Amino acid sequence: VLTHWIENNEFGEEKFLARNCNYCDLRVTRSSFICGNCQHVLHSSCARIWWEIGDECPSGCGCNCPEMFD
């Protein structure tokens, strides 16, 4: 099993922000977390912090990631 980034033709800020965490807004390169309903990354510490005080995706796309990452 290997992870593959979604390839999109971007030019500015969003090319850098496509591969960034959605809670701390930093680059993700190690120890990630990937949801399946919405394809948004998170850090390990960011997820273990956010899901204690969270119910939805931190990017606000309307996906209940605790029940829909499968």
Q: Does 32 bind Zn ion (CB under 5 A)?
A: no
Q: Which does 7 bind (CB under 5 to 8 A by kind): another protein, Zn ion, none?
A: none
CB atoms within 10 A of CB 66: 12
| Residues forming the site for another protein (CB under 8 A) | 1-6, 8, 12-20, 22-34, 36-41, 44-62, 65-66, 69-70
Q: Does 47 bind Zn ion (CB under 5 A)?
A: no
On whether the CB atoms of residues 37 and 63 are closer than 8 A, the answer is yes
- Minimum distance, C-beta of residue 1 to another protein, in the bound complex (Å): 6
Beta bridge pairs of residue 42: 33
